[PDB]
Design a protein around this ligand. Structure first.
Ligand SMILES: Cc1cc2nc3c(=O)[nH]c(=O)nc-3n(C[C@H](O)[C@H](O)[C@H](O)COP(=O)(O)OP(=O)(O)OC[C@H]3O[C@@H](n4cnc5c(N)ncnc54)[C@H](O)[C@@H]3O)c2cc1C
Ligand SMILES: Cc1cc2nc3c(=O)[nH]c(=O)nc-3n(C[C@H](O)[C@H](O)[C@H](O)COP(=O)(O)OP(=O)(O)OC[C@H]3O[C@@H](n4cnc5c(N)ncnc54)[C@H](O)[C@@H]3O)c2cc1C
Ligand SMILES: NC(=O)C1=CN([C@@H]2O[C@H](COP(=O)(O)OP(=O)(O)OC[C@H]3O[C@@H](n4cnc5c(N)ncnc54)[C@H](O)[C@@H]3O)[C@@H](O)[C@H]2O)C=CC1
Ligand SMILES: NC(=O)C1=CN([C@@H]2O[C@H](COP(=O)(O)OP(=O)(O)OC[C@H]3O[C@@H](n4cnc5c(N)ncnc54)[C@H](O)[C@@H]3O)[C@@H](O)[C@H]2O)C=CC1
Ligand code: FES
Lengths: 106, 402, 401
């Protein structure tokens, strides 16, 4: 069920705001105009990717161990992470940004 | 000059990181990788974390996906190589020819000789065999005695606690983590550890055991149902000294990973290289090194206009309520502090300086400072002393700008 | 081994390498490159007898055991490209090499404090670096000496005998700390002390005024001259710009190899495994240079020959003393032998480590040195009782036990 995790302004270009649906912390990023929502926790040492991390393009870097992933598929672009990020479907419906905390692919 | 065939001895993190840069830099010649362990190469750091918990060897698997058309020979030992024949004898009877040979055989743990014959179990923790074994020994109502107060004693202590084991810890130094942590952090962390259910014994010694009870030098008795020895690792350079290469508990290598032996390279824990920060040839026991020296060496092998390894040392430790990152030197003539050094909300950074220049820096639960201090390190910067201590200062605009 | 063979430097190390390459067989080309204009000479009689007579003829190395060598004398090597297999020299001449030997040794540490400071200021290492001294050691003169190192204390005692007023200030408590035993170093300060030499300690060094030499205790040390002996540093620049593994010397295995293929290194410029502690140090002696350089040449030529494997050892002539030191200065015990005498010395210190000899020392007592080197090399654990009985024959001991 799609549920509105934020606004299209809370999360601006090249930035990123977590979203804590239930206890389903979810990483939201804006890349040049497109939104891609991922699992907020780094698969290596479960550090927060939206808070503290560095999105360069569509690449999120981990500040803890400086590991790197793709925000569109959740695929590691650089270890230490061994596992890909699962990622959530995401709809924009005007000024609101929809995530269905189910169907989170991996 | 990189000449096929390429043969690597050891299938650890350095191996893996090494051959991916071989191919994923355009080298599609023959590669063979030998490892004396039987299992897909696995990341080591997660052993001290997750693994005691949800004991999954399947999420800590080194994913050698970036190394296509590599030959792995796992469960096979290398007994010897011949620098004059340019071959390696393996345990299963086979001969490996080489134009280029890479030693990346890591380091082994130096067990207890005083706990030579203990009626109780003891493990030195360095693999996904030992891992599985301690972990599964970690029951709720139980005892465990760790010997040594470095990162493995501390990291494993922490989860032993989360386990529900009443943990105590023998330390021969008057401090924990003498090898590579500022004293402030060490003194912090021990105080961290006391306030959790871990019983610390600095300055002491394991003189022996009795039946089911430990024996500190002070005659002390300790009922331990399980013991863990993390007294440190020694290089496995055995095949190296055997064949005449330069070795002093570790194999010496220059900036491209060259040994004193033509056609033979060396990477990772097994090696002794320059610390540009100190100028001394040290063994550098970090993941960080394991990988990046890995990469820097296989790309220079494929592109010689390219530089040799130059990066600066740094590592992490994730013990309990403390995500710690340490970079460069542990020692300075001045120390600067930021944040709140509390055992319940710890979130800070230490900066170590030497006549003004940053020689090092730690971060406890403060990742956002790490990267920018490391780059400051990398250019040996001497920033404004007062600004560095000004919490309104963000170290990123400082790192980034000038 | 690959011609043409090129050796950079022409000190004892290199001259022994090529003199031995030839002997060993090698009939290939060989070019040696020496920055100083001089035919290869010997350094020990520079702080010794040269100052007694001063004839360069007298302190000359035999190159006739090394026939057919293009000695480029008076030229400096500016770099080598290992990829190119070439050396760049200052005469604009290029040198292609098959095998390259770095035998550049090291240089006299300097001291800022005497940097363009009134009176003459010197270091002793080179021949030119010996006559300016020899022209300053006027029979009537004073003089001062930094560091109680092998050349400081050898020059202190060649001084005195001329009737030239020394004055030695060192930054450490005893003498000869880099290598001598503490036992040895006390007897040498009392001996020199007994010979004039106002030996000062833990006392550096500030301000020289054509009389008022430098010092932290306002002292008219008084001298027209100053010979400075504060230790030396590896000439490892070119291997360094080359990318070889260095750290105040070039790291080499027991075969002479550096981390750059086809490049070797010998003598004082190197850092090698000392088999007593098992550490890589600079072995800055006359015997290592000679011996290491021979053993590198020997295994290069013959494929089977074993690597270099001597334990350190040196000597020092200081006045009447004839000091010979073997191995490490200390262990967990020491036995003294003979006479420890002020005016007519003759004794032997042997160091032990959990009962095995690991060190020796002999002063004006050379028949005993030779056997202890022999027991020092096998790892012997002789009986300590017998070692101390002055009737025990150390040759008898060595040549059998
Ligand atoms: C429990 C633990 C926790 C750690 N935590 C951290 C951390 O938080 N942060 C950090 O920065 N670092 C950490 N490290 C350090 C890091 O894991 C090492 O720096 C890294 O593993 C170095 O790997 P390597 O490939 O150089 O050597 P290894 O990883 O040991 O690889 C060597 C391989 O070679 C094999 N081998 C050896 N001899 C032979 C032979 N003769 N024939 C065939 N195969 C041979 C070995 O058995 C092994 O398979 C940790 C290490 C451990 C053990
Ligand atoms: C005055 C003095 C007295 C000593 N007395 C004793 C003693 O009693 N006992 C003892 O055991 N030891 C003694 N020693 C030490 C011993 O003589 C040295 O260990 C030995 O000379 C070193 O051998 P080497 O050939 O490696 O070096 P060196 O003698 O330094 O020769 C190396 C040569 O390389 C040349 N070189 C350097 N760079 C270049 C370049 N770029 N191009 C070309 N040429 C270059 C140098 O100029 C030098 O001539 C003494 C040393 C000195 C200076
Ligand atoms: C990673 O993994 C490897 C192993 O890490 P660690 O085992 O933590 O080594 P470590 O070297 O980081 O720490 C070992 C600690 O144990 C102490 N110790 C040594 N002998 C002891 C003894 N007999 N009893 C009690 N304490 C003793 C040391 O003083 C040191 O604090 C290292 O390379 C590290 O960098
Ligand atoms: C030969 O020749 C080479 C050079 O011999 P030496 O120069 O005698 O070296 P050395 O190493 O034998 O002695 C140098 C001496 O100078 C002292 N020293 C170090 N720094 C000093 C300082 N700043 N001011 C005053 N004293 C200082 C040391 O304590 C030591 O006693 C050696 O390799 C030797 O074996
Ligand atoms: S937690 Fe992100 S790479 Fe370690």
């Amino acid at each position: 069920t799609f549920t509105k995790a934020c606004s299209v302004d809370e999360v601006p270009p090249g930035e990123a705001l977590q979203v804590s649906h239930d206890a389903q912390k979810v990483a939201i990023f804006n890349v040049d105009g497109e939104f891609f929502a991922t699992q907020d926790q780094c698969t290596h040492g479960e550090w927060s990717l939206s808070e503290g991390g560095y999105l360069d393009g569509d690449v999120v870097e981990c500040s803890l161990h400086m590991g790197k992933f793709c925000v569109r598929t959740g695929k590691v672009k650089s270890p230490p992470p061994c596992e890909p990020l699962k990622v959530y479907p995401i709809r924009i419906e005007g000024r609101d940004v929809l995530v269905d905390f189910s169907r989170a692919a991996l | 000059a990189l000449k096929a065939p390429v043969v690597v001895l050891g299938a650890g993190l350095a191996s893996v990181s090494f051959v991916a840069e071989l191919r994923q830099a355009g080298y599609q010649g023959l590669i063979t990788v030998v490892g004396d362990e039987a299992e897909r190469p696995y990341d080591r750091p997660p052993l001290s974390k997750d693994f005691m918990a949800h004991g999954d060897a399947e999420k800590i698997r080194l994913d050698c996906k970036r190394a296509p058309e590599v030959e792995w020979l796992l469960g096979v030992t290398a007994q010897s190589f011949d620098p004059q024949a340019h071959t390696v004898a393996l345990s299963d009877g086979r001969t490996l020819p080489y134009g280029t040979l890479v030693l990346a055989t890591g380091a082994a743990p130096r067990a207890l000789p005083t706990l030579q014959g203990a009626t109780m179990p003891v493990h030195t923790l360095r693999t996904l065999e030992d891992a599985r074994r301690i972990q599964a020994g970690l029951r709720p109502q139980s005892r465990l005695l760790i010997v040594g107060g470095g990162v493995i004693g501390l990291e494993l202590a922490a989860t032993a606690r989360t386990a529900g084991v009443h943990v105590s810890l023998v330390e021969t130094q008057p401090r924990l983590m003498s090898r590579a942590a500022p004293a402030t952090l060490a003194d912090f962390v021990a105080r961290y550890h006391a306030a959790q259910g871990v019983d610390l014994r600095f300055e002491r010694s394991v003189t022996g055991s009795v039946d089911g009870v430990v024996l500190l030098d002070d005659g002390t008795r300790i009922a331990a149902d399980m013991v863990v020895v993390g007294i440190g690792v020694l290089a496995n350079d055995a095949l190296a000294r055997a064949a005449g290469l330069a070795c002093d508990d570790g194999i010496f290598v220059d900036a491209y990973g060259r040994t004193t032996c033509p056609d033979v390279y060396a990477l990772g824990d097994v090696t002794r290289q320059r610390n540009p920060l100190s100028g001394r040839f040290e063994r550098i026991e970090t993941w960080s090194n394991a990988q990046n020296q890995g990469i820097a060496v296989a790309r220079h092998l494929v592109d010689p206009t390219a530089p040799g390894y130059a990066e600066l040392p740094w590592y992490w430790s994730d013990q309990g309520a403390l995500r710690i990152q340490v970079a460069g030197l542990a020692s300075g003539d001045e120390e600067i502090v930021r944040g709140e050094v509390s055992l319940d909300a710890p979130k800070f950074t230490l900066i170590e300086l030497q006549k003004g220049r940053i020689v090092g820096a730690t971060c406890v639960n403060n990742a956002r400072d790490f990267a920018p201090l490391r780059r400051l390190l990398a250019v040996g910067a001497k920033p404004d002393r007062a600004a560095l201590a000004d919490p309104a200062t963000d170290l990123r605009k400082l790192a980034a700008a000038v």
